[PDB]
Symmetry: C3
Subunit: 108 residues, 3 copies
């Protein structure tokens, strides 16, 4: 029955097709979700917000003022959650860069 959570065309299937770099080989994996989860706890943010569009949207709001001075860890976290937001919104992005384009396009 496990196969119900890994349906073709579903969120996890989509996640694992998205490329890290706009013109790159490597793709998002389960370990990127696990890592994003740990990071939010270190930042005293509820990791359960990763599960929904609205939760990802609120996280991205919390993190946005910190982006400009933020370390690489912080920018990577923001980029990862932007991709998760697109997956939950069923927006068909091919890479991290398109996810960022969509998010800042939405904020307009």
């Amino acid at each position: 029955g496990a196969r119900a959570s890994v349906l073709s065309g579903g969120e996890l299937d989509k996640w694992e097709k998205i490329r890290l770099r706009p013109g790159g080989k490597k793709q998002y994996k389960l370990k990127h979700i696990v890592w994003a989860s740990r990071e939010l706890e270190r930042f005293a943010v509820n990791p359960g917000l990763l599960e929904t569009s609205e939760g990802c949207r609120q996280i991205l709001g919390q993190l946005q003022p910190s982006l400009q001075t933020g370390s690489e860890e912080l920018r990577s976290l923001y980029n990862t959650i932007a991709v998760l937001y697109c997956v939950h919104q069923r927006i068909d992005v091919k890479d991290t860069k398109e996810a960022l384009d969509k998010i800042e396009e939405e904020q307009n």
Copy 2:
């Protein structure tokens, strides 16, 4: 002479009568103060502010914007300091829930 800091009806005596849950058995102990202290240091906040009404009020102000997305650790910290604020204000709350009621009632 130690008994001067644990006077009947004093702050520590009151602290240790307050219940964690509105309808629960367990009560606040010294270890909850110790834990709140460690947490504020992790957040780069002066733990000495726990000693006064005004310091607890300023901490609660710093933490309030983080509550909505905050982890359980963060909410627990806020709840604990809300109870400490009530003790320092000599407001006779019976549990964490009444402390929260009083704090947000005061902010009106």
Copy 3:
């Protein structure tokens, strides 16, 4: 060729003449820069901003709202970056206190 980075009258030479306390003996050393660097990473702030006037200015902006409730670690970090800002600006401060005077004087 290493001597090109430790020119007399240059930034590192100036740094290591500045006194920690307004009327004190001890002076800023390399370990204070190393420590400030680690601290910014713990705060998810890009340590590379320590390298420029503008980066130090942005860090000080990020940290300023946290100063009033901040722990000693936080105040020490702010004080150290204020001195670095003065060195990068070629402002000839003799101690931490003069650096703080200059920074808040500039913000007027």
